[model samples]
Target: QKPYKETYGISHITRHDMLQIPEQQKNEKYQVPEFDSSTIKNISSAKGLDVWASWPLQNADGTVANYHGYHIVFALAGDPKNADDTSIYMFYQKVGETSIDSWKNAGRVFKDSDKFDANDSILKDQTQEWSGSATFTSDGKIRLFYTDFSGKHYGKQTLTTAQVNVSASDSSLNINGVEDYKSIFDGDGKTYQNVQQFIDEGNYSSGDNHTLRDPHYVEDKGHKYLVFEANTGTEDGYQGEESLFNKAYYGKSTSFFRQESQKLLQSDKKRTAELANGALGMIELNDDYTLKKVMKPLIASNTVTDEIERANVFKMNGKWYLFTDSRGSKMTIDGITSNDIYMLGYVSNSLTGPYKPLNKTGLVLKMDLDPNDVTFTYSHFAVPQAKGNNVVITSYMTNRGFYADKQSTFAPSFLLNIKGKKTSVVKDSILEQGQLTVNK
Candidate 1:
């Protein structure tokens, strides 16, 4: 009754098979800077490194929250109670139409925290440690793929892949070496070469119970799907923690993971979740790269704003979208509305969703109007898509997700857009300050 339908079939999956993937066109019309570009700057350099000086925000009522501008975030060990230790930070600025200075800390990428000796190496602590995100590959080269959690779902620690390098013209040391950190994704780390039981969570004690954490990647029509968020108590639980912390559940499986195991990937359904955290999902990587998970969960609404999980799936106009955020302590964000902290949508036509939610009222992006500084912070919300340049590649979370109880680092907001639909960042609308704005 439950052998393949989900363990592999993922519960049969549905939702018009997820709108059949095929939407790409942004023929010019890009502008951002409404009050949501917080100045950007978070540093810890000279070797123990972690630097930032990111920019491209302007919402105080001007619009342009993301259009690719400024990036200098590094220091990632991807959360698992901080196991051993983690750090990898680096960003860059100066590309397109840029001109809003005062946000720079740039550089730092190393981890071993206490010498674990795999090669006596450094920089290897990424296991969903407070949700790390980065993707830039079509060959130009830029990769920071993560989902390493020795914590659950199959625990033996499911999800692993490492490789981050950037310095091109010396962002002050530029990634360093081990070839500058290369493992190019081995998701489950190639099962740790052959099998230490996939090295930790493979023998699967149910992966210790689930907290897989914010993962949503795509490359449709050519293959590359990675939709994430675990802990419906391992997709369907018992052993109980209120049904295993019952809420915030999501599923859409698939993984060629680093590339080719007959190219594994799943999901034809299950998009949103609830209990506490928001769950965002996506799929479509055919042309033989195979994957189609979108069963349903593009964001249903039981509504709990604070634990609004890390989503960031996207596709504009032809529809199919999911962007999320909600810190919850009552989560009151009304600075006149404009990127209030992020959350956008559309997903219909079977993208396995009902996803509708963009007539406005929560596309929010205002972490003190970040470009960096005042303790730089912008928590997980990715949307990587840049081939012909519909332009998209965003990642940020520099402070307050957890370095353990309290201590933060992570930044990058490199791309934003949306006009006429109403977006703002509080400049004078009732005094929000960064004054960001968007309307579409």
Candidate 2:
């Protein structure tokens, strides 16, 4: 048998690639973009606010969906001191309004009036909402896909969706309520890790967490789909299963791979346990947003890491590009010690694909790894632009001291030029924090 990646047409961030990251392609050293506390204060007056993992309103066809010439964006906001107090918040800036000052704070997107059952079930210290995609349909209905969490249920996570009721005007927009909420997909324990399995094994809730979230919406060639983050399940031929990797270890002709296999086989059993099953999952959706089919993962990091968050996709230059953000410290690949902040990506000819790495390594954007570095940023999302082969990169920044600082904000949004298999960040097109509109 071949390695899972080789057999299924998937790619990965290997130990070799981690060390071989080209110096010229690495992100140049820089601090928070030139700005003072006043520029930071301009975001909103909401108290205890920490925003991250944002997405914009899109049309059902996956273009940047706008309403009333106003670009709407959604992000998860929580108490800076409490990661569990998360909720969905809205921000709206009129199209072509070039200043952050005009970005009005639309406040919490759900309320008791809207009957968001999860939000109403005892609100304190609960991290109920995480990141997801929201799109507008032809009938003007808003399709909202988001991660639903239940800490009370022993750290349960579900891929959920619902409809949003809205009322808007020139300067004010009201998210009256949410409706028809449904927990569409939870991992089956066969193709994805399950909460019960994690609990039965006594895994720490704060650790890997057995992820099944971040469902991004896509409509391609008359097929509706979602690409999200998940982990390997207990089924034959599952992408994250290690039987193939074990076989490859003895069968591979390359010295490099054979050596890697030896290291994995000899290391602590934990090195190859449930922790190494990180994967990028996909699913097809019916027109009614119901589950049609659960597809195999597009990528899996076997014996490498356990988490790859925020998997997203875009179509550029007649190729399908899939992107996800990963942390290097989670890697168990032998000889990889760098605390790498990475936005990893891949490309294919179709939405569900036999994909290959982009730029020979799948590395798109990377930040410095020094523990002394004060500036830290994460959750890089590529927002496609209206003109040219450019994508506006949107992400959040925090002090090296995250919890101690109790501050998570946005900054130094930049542009990346992607053509065919190569990608590079545009050095001069850096924009303000949270500026993710697709209009030119």
Candidate 3:
């Protein structure tokens, strides 16, 4: 029998799934996009190097939302060379304009100096805006939830939200009457790092740390919540010793990954503690957008990897699918040479799930693996479609890997055909580069 309790099985990335990567090379059939990166011009020089984005602001049910036929979007854009000089920038594309030129720069969304005043002074020093989500509130206002960070990412992070008014015209980007802003919640120490623990662990010695960012918003039934990327707190997955998780699934467990997980658990105590903390954290939210309760992780990569970024959710065909991105290099498993970029998926019967990996293994899209490739994409999100089990996989391509050149632009997106719990990249549906929206 398995050692752990059956209470809401903490969905995880196992060595089993990580090993299947070689033979299951799902991305070998498609070519990563190739573009001048120079062609991705913004109307204003200030908003260049755009990378991450919110789905076209939609309704709570995951349906497309538009203002007078124009789909609104907010993206993180800044200097190509300076990662710290980032902020939320607004843009819009007509409902079906999938061309690179269809995007109209709506200008910078908010001044960091103004919106971030109530929070940490460090972020105020640099005013960095990371990935976030947006949806049209029930009352017709645009509710934007985003991540605020210190200029140097290793600094701090907070979950923030703002409500804006959209005027009745589509002639320009007018979705910004930012009347209210709230620094709703930082880390909750017991389950996730609080501000104090985060600061103390700055430039963490083991250096396997990642920011608690990417606050993706979702609503199910009548409840609302935010599922963001964060690490387990001292009291939560306390990794001071070999975790019960590893002990249960790894050492002498007889599972396929028993040997690998056992070796990792025994290798270095300090390193295991630091790396096992990456979790897809969650919290219930009040109708007014205040913190309700900081719940347990929907999934945690204890003893597997240290970074699970861009946690997002989509309910399709009455099932909840959870998705996140991770790098193989960050894994603690003995010999995974495929520092493969991945957008992993999981499915659960409920929102806060005991989710099982999608496609029997969670490998939704194994992104470009060649170290020499410059157009490789990361920060993937699944934007649910109107029919069937199809969702357009959206991500930005950039020189984020071994390449030295600064090229950050939207990669050619493709479709994922998900049926029941299995998901595969629709081979021929690859859209054009810089195509941020669906082909429809």
Candidate 4:
């Protein structure tokens, strides 16, 4: 028998039925929680990242609390959203406290000054700091991996990491020390030290362009690994078609290639490749947080949408699940128009999966079902809890009228239901009960 009390306990068939019902009807079935207070919204105006943890964090004084156990980081994009003007910051939160309420305006953790120097670096002037992932290592070091764009075009994406120690004091995590940030080498054994390096050396490809960003980390059985988005080729391109391809499609070409038309054409190529060939590849890391080997992608296919963002892998109840997102994706199945802003799923018995689609529509959460709501939900990440077979998925709701004003909240806890090859989230809504099981 499982040691913990089940927080979310709906059956598989019940969840499948809920997803199969009409969107309007399903809304009637599950009521949306009122997320009146949000951590990020109360502190500043910004788009946010996921709040991650399975258990509450231990304080420096040896007292443990839920807020100290998780890290909430996000980008502070300045006006007109220029990259050079951007900065990234984080806050700590307890189990019941909102991320915004928990934020204490800790100074920026990562920026261009800390990264760019005079030698072997073209990112010296660029200010755009994009998204990635963060987690605490086994030895208690906070490892932050993020994307740094070198050029004004923002096409050159590089993965890098910074190690620090955070301590709990005054209801906040103090950044005790920060190691120098460094570029990660790709599978090809070349350094991702700059945009030129990423364009010329990286192994994955989608048309003449590529996107390699948003890295997530997982450690199991004394082994460390990372899963990130990539647009590998599905098939050989047309022979000599490289010339016909817009010059901008290739990195750093002429002025016309940089124009809007060429940019759109290149985007089309990436979308098509990702829909059929997009992948979440795994890489093993050494104990010192260096790249060891690039394993085969965990999953890839043409059956689903191609743009895989923030792909995360985790194990629950001896089963492995892959949670991913594709913004503004639409699929028509069973003559019902189904749309997903983000999706979560699992493979019953394998890490390399024939991942079973969770609901009839294969979505852990749904948004924009209400015709009146323009921007209902987007860019969510799930935090698997420590004491149950459930996860707390958090997301922000914004309206089309004001995209910047986003409100954050957690959904009802979802129970993982694995019945043979099928997997789905049974609505538990445990957080709504206001009784979280804190690991003391």
Candidate 5:
């Protein structure tokens, strides 16, 4: 039993020859690693925030996909559209941490900033649409789910286009109040006409062409599960560029962290929506809510070889993990995917898998360093945390392409160090996770 390296060691060291990442690094030109911003708290709320996507990554000969930036990360609040105007919003950034490589604003602290202050924290002004895996719920409460394409409210867009709220913060962290922003698009002078009655209510919420992104939650026995990301397009959007949803789906949420009454625990959608270029998915909530879809479509990164896209999923020890943007399509946008870029994983006792692949050829945090000029690595994602010691947080959205008025802003956040199976990445600082216990 103790033979696979004292029984599978280096955290079991999955394939890809223990990772050495070098497709470029012919000898230097990609710098990003100075994160420790004094332990970070410069939240500033909103002076600027941003997010945008499109990672092409091409070049095996035909050439294309050389990057410097790409961005997407969001979280900041205060503003009920004008609930007495306290202002000060924010929404996502972190891959390079500044100098405006790609994060130019709209990580959405109410889109154009500064105003929330009854001590501020109704999530500041609640806007749910970017949904990228944020979790908490064993009693500590704290919820944020996404996938509501601005249906503004609840006109009934089937197969469940999402929006779950309830973590306005209180007992201490302060977002002021605590409950009361239960949006299915709740009535507010008719929030843009119930956001088109939640998009003319049609998508049917779940029959399976897939198309859902980042929606994590877990509670088991007491029952509560959500694990999202199942793509293929056309319930309303998404056609095929990355095609195949990658795979992930499990449901049953009646409120461990508030989905209100969510239920539907099983739909492989004929095996993870087809496949061609998947993006991010993770699961592991088991306190009593029972969920265990560790990782699938745990995509390594590709445009045909390298240049991965926005993937960020997590779990440690019990195994199931991720972090992508490994050269995210060569960086035409604003470039950010640093740390020589490499953080990958997989372990299966069973969350969902016949799993095995630490890197069939991937996982190379910095096989040596190679970026010929426009450089920045650590793509658009990474995250894993239940609370400290075992930490992982990743972000990106640096400003490039899909251009946003040219404000040229830069958002950032990164920290890593998960002991057990050996993993340490904590750039810049502010290394805090889940329960917030950062007394330091």
Candidate 6:
């Protein structure tokens, strides 16, 4: 009955068997390969720009193709020398079934066009078009959901999607048939279905720096949901006053992300403090895959100022696992000086969770060599494999700073230990699923 006061302890999830590949040995340790084209100039130069969402597609004739999805890659206009003028491009990798390295860049499945221009009401900005998540629709088409940054407009927190035909034979996506951004329906009386209305009206949006981005799709139970990076706000201007309205004294913070001093720094009640600092927002979906209602926080931001990105949810051994990458949240291991960021985790017994920490510090998987190592490994898109609770985890590496490099490498995958847990994880293999294709 005490939902607000529930606290969880780290269970048996450990990092003893985790794998890490050094940057100098990436090309030698793994088969070096190339995509269709060279890096798309400045767009690919950014820290966050790389292949993130990935899925495996099987053909009717028993052939399988791996789809590596990425955004913010630029395509030069008709004039080759004109580097100044370019349009945004969405690229996917078409890796054959033989091996992960045996792949070729299929290139430009979605390109900037008139219908999706910079001034369009739906997707206002093209330059900021960065990251996105994708999944296979019930009818076998690729349903891509991406961020439409409306920095020019208020409540501009917009998320868009399109269904495209992915060729079963070659894994080439049909860009012509890509649909417009679908409308999100919230039953509430908000003006636009963008992020602003979703949070403002719902009392979920807060913090002075208010940001809503990164829409990741997951289909579970009989419902489809979109999990996003969000901020948590206080209720009714009550900043832990110890009054009748503010009876729930959740106590001081102990996590590395959130701080107790930050709460005392807020003088006003409704100034939008980072209580659970950076949080995750869950939105339920209708059968047709449109937003139906906003669900509660799958993982609350807690006392940390960490911005959790790309939150992925899956069930294993009767426990719910929420995996995400964080920025501004630092950690140290073996007294490593490089101190790169890492992917964090939370485990809960319920779907709508009172999720507790998975590790003592909530550090799930880290990608660093040791004290002096530099090649940062961060953006991890984990794909659940066919073997016993093992996930084929792929992370991007960079030499730019903490987590940037010329190219990304595949970190050795491992099995999540759910051996002794309250619930058993449902076994759903993406590999064993058959291919169902359609025609235009």
TM-score, structure 2 vs. true: 0.86
Per lDDT, the best of the predicted structures is 2
Off by over 4 Å in 6: 1-101, 114-120, 151-157, 170-176, 183-208, 233-276, 329-340, 367-374, 399-405, 408-440
The digit string of per-residue lDDT tens for model 1 on 1-440 reads 11122222112111112111111001111111232335433322222232221212211111122313333333343333444344444433433312223223343343444123323121243333334344444543444434444333233222223444444552332554323232222222111111232234334332221233454455444456655443222232211223212222112333211121111112111111112222343333333222333233344222122134555554444545555554323222112222233333333433445444333233334333443333344553433233222323233334433333223333333444433333232232211111111111
Please give the range of 10 consecutive residues that has the lowest summed lDDT in model 6.
431-440
**CA error at residue 283 for candidate 2, angstroms:** 0.9
Q: Report the number of clashing residue pairs per model.
A: 123, 0, 0, 12, 84, 16
- For residues 180-282, write the lDDT of model 3, one tens digit per residue: 6777777867788665664565556645475588888889887888999988776656433445345433322356445564555467643654456678888
Q: Comparing candidate 1 with candidate 4, which one achieves the higher TM-score?
A: 4
TM-score of each: 0.28, 0.86, 0.86, 0.64, 0.27, 0.60
Better of 5 and 6 by TM-score: 6
> Which residues of candidate 5, in runs, are more than 4 Å off?
1-11, 14-16, 23-339, 343-350, 364-379, 382-440
Cα lDDT, model 2, residue 48? 49
How does residue 200 of candidate 1 score in lDDT? 41
Q: How far is candidate 3 from the true structure (C-alpha RMSD, Å)?
A: 3.8
Q: Candidate 5, residues 336-405: lDDT per residue as tens digits?
A: 2332444444444443433444334334244213432111223433444434564433333232222233
Clashes of 6: 16
Worst 10 residues of 2 by lDDT: 29-38
Candidate 1 vs candidate 6, lDDT winner: 6
lDDT of 5: 0.30
